[PDB]
Structure 1
Amino acid sequence: AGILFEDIFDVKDIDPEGKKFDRVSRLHCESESFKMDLILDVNIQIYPVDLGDKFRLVIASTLYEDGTLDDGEYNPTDDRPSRADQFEYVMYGKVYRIEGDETSTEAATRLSAYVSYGGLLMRLQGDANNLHGFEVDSRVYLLMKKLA
């Protein structure tokens, strides 16, 4: 239904290399179910975050949840198809590189996808059966919400 990635993540590091930028912090995350680690850059003044915080992640091509493409234009008056708004933090960006672990004999025993949100970047090492939905030069969304 347009969802490319479903997982629940947890944080352990807030800035291992230091507080490089004042309004952007570099999170380090990993899951508990299917074991993919994560790094991500999140704004802080519009979204507080701290250590030991659990959240679930949704990566979708479109927010319409109907399979119809949005083509990447800001339409604030097009809230009719009831976009994915129940989640309280939304990003938008594109991928730029999808590289894994190839020795030219087997086929991608692990995949690490790089996604750029206009400068805010993430990275997803994991099995290829969970990251095969990502295609190079494709527009994707990111969804965030808190968990109890």
Structure 2
Amino acid sequence: GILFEDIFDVKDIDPEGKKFDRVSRLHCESESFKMDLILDVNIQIYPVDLGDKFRLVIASTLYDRPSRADQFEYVMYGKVYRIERLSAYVSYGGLLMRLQGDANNLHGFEVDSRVYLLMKKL
């Protein structure tokens, strides 16, 4: 059911300076796919640091009774809202994600569809 997944390396914890006390905007790079993503992460619950390999999975569904995909340890929920090497803008309420690049592996995406994140440190 997975739309998209790979291992990512966060390179700028916050690129233009800390603007918020609970959310910092990461800049990452993939492993051998070279998908740039610009992801906001609530760091009070899930602190992230510079140069930290972390998994990232985009899933349309998670399948406490149906026993969810919970091996990952940070799960958001939001919808894709723009597709502009394709960019693919996902919004998580206010937390933006601009997963980019190489439109052959981005093929699962669409517009106006519900999308989960499932992150995990390594």
Query: Above 0.5 in TM-score?
Result: yes
Displacement of 1:117 in angstroms is 0.2
Q: CA deviation at 1:33?
A: 1.4
Corresponding pairs, count: 121
Once structures 1 and 2 are overlaid, which stretch shifts more, 32-41 or 136-145? 32-41
Match in the other structure for 1:117: 92
C-alpha separation in 2, matches of 1:45 and 1:34: 29
Task: Give the deviation of 1:128 after TM superposition.
Answer: 1.2
So what's the TM-score if we normalise by structure 1? 0.79
1:9-55: per-residue Cα shift (whole Å, max 9, x none)? 00110112110111100000001211111110001111111001001
Taking the TM superposition and a 5 Å limit, the aligned residue runs for 1:1-148 are 2-64=1-63, 79-98=64-83, 110-147=85-122
Q: Distance in 2 between matches of 1:49 and 1:125?
A: 21
C-alpha distance in 1, partners of 2:5/2:24? Answer: 23
Unaligned stretches of 5+ residues in structure 1 = 65-78, 99-109
SS of the aligned residue for 1:89 comes to coil
Matched residues in 1 for 2:25 and 2:5: separation? 21
Cα deviation digits, residues 66-120 of structure 1 (max 9, x gap): xxxxxxxxxxxxx22211011111000001101xxxxxxxxxxx11000000000
User: Over alpha carbons, which structure has the higher Rg?
Assistant: 1
2-structure distance, mates of 1:80, 1:29 = 34
Q: Specify every segment of 5 or more residues in structure 2 that has no aligned partner in the other structure, as ranges.
A: none
Q: CA deviation at 1:141?
A: 0.2
TM-score calculated relative to the size of structure 2: 0.96
Aligned Cα RMSD in Å?
A: 0.8
Alpha-carbon shift at residue 126 of structure 1 (Å): 1.4
Identity in percent: 100
Structure 1 stretches of 4+ moved >2 Å: none
User: Helix, strand or coil for the counterpart of 1:34?
Assistant: coil
Shift of 1:124: 1.3
